[PDB]
Amino acid sequence: EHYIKHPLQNRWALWFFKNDKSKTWQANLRLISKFDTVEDFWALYNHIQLSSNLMPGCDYSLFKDGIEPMWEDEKNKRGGRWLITLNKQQRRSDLDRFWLETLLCLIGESFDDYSDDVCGAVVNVRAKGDKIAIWTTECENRDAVTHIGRVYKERLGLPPKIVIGYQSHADTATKSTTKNRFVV
Numbered sequence: 522e523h524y525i526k527h528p529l530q531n532r533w534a535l536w537f538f539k540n541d542k543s544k545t546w547q548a549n550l551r552l553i554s555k556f557d558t559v560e561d562f563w564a565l566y567n568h569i570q571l572s573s574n575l576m577p578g579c580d581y582s583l584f585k586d587g588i589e590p591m592w593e594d595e596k597n598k599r600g601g602r603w604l605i606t607l608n609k610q611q612r613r614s615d616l617d618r619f620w621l622e623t624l625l626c627l628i629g630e631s632f633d634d635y636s637d638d639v640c641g642a643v644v645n646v647r648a649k650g651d652k653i654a655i656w657t658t659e660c661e662n663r664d665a666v667t668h669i670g671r672v673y674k675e676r677l678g679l680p681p682k683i684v685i686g687y688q689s690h691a692d693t694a695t696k697s698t699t700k701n702r703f704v705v
């Protein structure tokens with residue numbers, strides 16, 4: 522009846538975004554819960570919906586405690602994201618897998634000397650095509666951004682034929698195509 526808890530390096534918060542066009546974007550975001558142990562992560566993951574079962578327009582976000590999953594956050598305003606784009610068939614094939622490995626990538630501190638630059642990750646469930654992104658705190662840190670993208674792409678088994686791009690939040694938020702600051 523003894524249950525050991527394995528600590529994580531950081532405390533993490535899972536966020537949920539609901540699809541509702543009658544409310545503003547900020548009003549559709551809500552905090553689910555937080556955790557800082559391996560056991561509490563799986564407890565949360567095992568009782569929430571899989572990403573492939575979300576209604577279109579919904580998001581999941583896992584960010585470090587104190588960072589909100591929005592581009593106006595103080596830890597995100599100068600940063601950016603490595604973006605992955607999936608087709609419709611990739612949803613049943615790879616969406617749930619890619620998201621779980623992403624979650625374990627985050628909470629495992631798998632980015633060597635640049636783990637502190639990581640802010641979180643977001644998965645968007647969209648009818649036009651699902652997206653998964655890992656957010657970093659500073660888009661001008663070339664060593665941090667390129668290292669995080671290389672580790673992330675390899676840890677998710679993506680073939681080298683597919684090229685993933687990094688984009689600044691400030692550039693994305695003012696888009697009137699969002700150019701890539703880096704490619705891996």
Ligand SMILES: Nc1nc2c(ncn2[C@@H]2O[C@H](COP(=O)([O-])OP(=O)([O-])OP(=O)([O-])OC[C@H]3O[C@@H](n4c[n+](Cc5ccccc5)c5c(=O)nc(N)[nH]c54)[C@H](O)[C@@H]3O)[C@@H](O)[C@H]2O)c(=O)[nH]1
Nearest residue numbers: 541542543544545546547549578590591592593647690693
């Ligand atoms: N009323 C109502 N309308 C909604 C709602 N959701 C969509 N629409 C409208 O629906 C139509 C079709 O687009 P869509 O279905 O493709 O939504 P999308 O596919 O999600 O596109 P998006 O990603 O361009 O986001 C679209 C807009 O969402 C707001 N947004 C998104 N992020 C997350 C975010 C963070 C970093 C990088 C990129 C994104 C943030 C953020 O961090 N901080 C703030 N302040 N705003 C953020 C912002 O305004 C953005 O321009 C369009 O007219 C939409 O405006 C809604 O909740 N309510």
